[PDB]
């Protein structure tokens, strides 16, 4: 539910940013003295940073699990500080 909504919002933001980069029509509009593309990119980054960080943490955990390291203290620290 919540995860699906966040993923859909991130996908929509990415598609809008790609369209703005490819099409200069959107760039012709500016808000508060700033280009619309910059604001769209900032909003997309704000709304997708959580998902990006979660994916990065999952990848790091997967890499650590495949690694030969098996110390209990290191695993506990990683789990606590993730």
Q: How far apart are CA 54 and CA 65, in angstroms?
A: 16
- Token code pair at residue 71: 């110390």
d(CA 39, CA 31): 8
Element at 69 (helix H, strand E): none
Q: How was this structure determined?
A: cryo-EM
Burial of 16 (0-12, 13-18, 19+ CB in 10 A): middle
Q: What is the DSSP letter of 67?
A: S
* Distance from C-alpha of 24 to C-alpha of 5, rounded to nearest angstrom: 29
SS3 state at 64: helix
In which element (H, E) is residue 31 found?
Answer: strand 30-31
Closest CA to 44 of 2, 9, 4, 3: 9
Among 10, 1, 5, CA closest to 55: 10
In angstroms, rounded to a whole number, what is the distance separating the alpha carbons of residues 39 and 15?
A: 14
């Amino acid at each position: 539910t919540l995860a699906l909504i966040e993923s859909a919002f991130f996908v929509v933001i990415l598609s809008a940013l790609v369209a703005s980069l490819t099409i200069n029509v959107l760039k012709h509009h500016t808000f508060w003295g700033l280009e619309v593309w910059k604001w769209c990119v900032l909003v997309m980054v704000i709304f997708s940073g959580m998902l990006v960080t979660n994916w990065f943490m999952r990848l790091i955990v997967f890499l650590i699990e495949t690694n030969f390291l098996l110390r209990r203290k290191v695993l506990y620290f990683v789990h606590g500080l993730k």
